[PDB]
Write a protein that binds this ligand. Structure first.
Ligand SMILES: O=c1[nH]cnc2c1ncn2[C@@H]1O[C@H](COP(=O)(O)O)[C@@H](O)[C@H]1O
Ligand SMILES: O=c1[nH]cnc2c1ncn2[C@@H]1O[C@H](COP(=O)(O)O)[C@@H](O)[C@H]1O
Lengths: 164, 164
């Protein structure tokens, strides 16, 4: 009974699957000979993370963190590691900006960002996104891990509501 | 370059996909008219969780917890909710046993368990598993979210090593 909202942004499970596989392939190529450490930003990015890692045929480690201050700390060391932050959607960029400064403080070998979506018209602070799934217009999206008042994270596709 | 180990347990991505879809269907049927709250036990169950929820066409909420004592607490209320714990693999059952007592203490409306795997020959404490993916022989498995010294969680299939 998965039903799309009536918003302007709509991305099918098929379109998402293909893009994620493409991103995984790019990462595998860019990180050949390396062992990246992917950090999933909970809760929204967990499905993107699950699909993305399965498309990266390289030896790698993972960790999970919650941010909003951080509600969940890192468990594995990141110093000297080639880190890849996995985000759901970059809106104003404030959260990612804070996260990047936090991670850089531990002196990782490098840090790149993978994000399923980005709403650049809302950007308040410039943050990098090396692996972007889709650039979209300003709209509240949900599904594929992203919530609407805690619900709808289970929709296999990305949908949205009207600003109304 | 995803390569299987030489252990006795081997489960393909295809076999896993079909089983997870079956489990999701059962849950959707069993919980018709309800709004379950699925709690993913990190880190191992995150991929099973990602695939499972996308196979449950019902309105539902989610949360994530880390256990080993708990390393990550619950954020959403569970009192009066129909809770479904999502685990990666039940070995001795000690962890799940502790988790169930913890959750029951908050008086949820009900609690059921979904687990991808179970090694019953290792069971030290009897714990319920209402939605089980596969019952397997005693072996150390990895892949599909489960790690081998933090690595191999990204394998799209379940594999194993030899006890040797
Ligand atoms: O359109 C949306 N749908 C769902 N969540 C969103 C949306 N926009 C922003 N968020 C959440 O806000 C968090 C940080 O947003 P930011 O700090 O403004 O870039 C993201 O990681 C999302 O969890
Ligand atoms: O064969 C295995 N492979 C990977 N992890 C395992 C295996 N067996 C047990 N575990 C981990 O041990 C945790 C709890 O095991 P238990 O308390 O003995 O039932 C599970 O949630 C897994 O994360």
């Amino acid at each position: 009974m998965f039903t799309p909202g009536n918003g302007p942004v709509q991305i099918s499970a098929e379109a998402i699957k293909k893009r994620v596989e493409e991103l995984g392939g790019e990462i595998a190529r860019d990180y050949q000979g390396k062992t990246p450490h992917l950090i999933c930003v909970l809760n929204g990015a967990f499905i993107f993370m699950a699909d993305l890692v399965r498309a990266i045929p390289l030896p790698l480690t993972m960790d999970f963190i919650a941010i909003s201050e951080l509600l969940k700390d890192l468990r594995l060391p990141i110093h000297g590691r080639d880190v890849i932050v996995v985000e759901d959607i970059v809106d104003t960029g404030l959260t990612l900006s804070y996260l990047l400064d936090y991670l850089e403080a531990r002196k990782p070998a490098s840090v790149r960002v993978a994000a399923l979506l980005s709403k650049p018209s809302r950007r308040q602070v410039e943050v990098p996104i090396h692996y972007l799934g889709f650039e979209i217009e300003d709209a509240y999206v949900y599904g594929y891990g992203l919530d609407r008042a805690q619900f709808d994270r289970n929709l296999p596709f990305i949908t949205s509501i009207r600003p109304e």
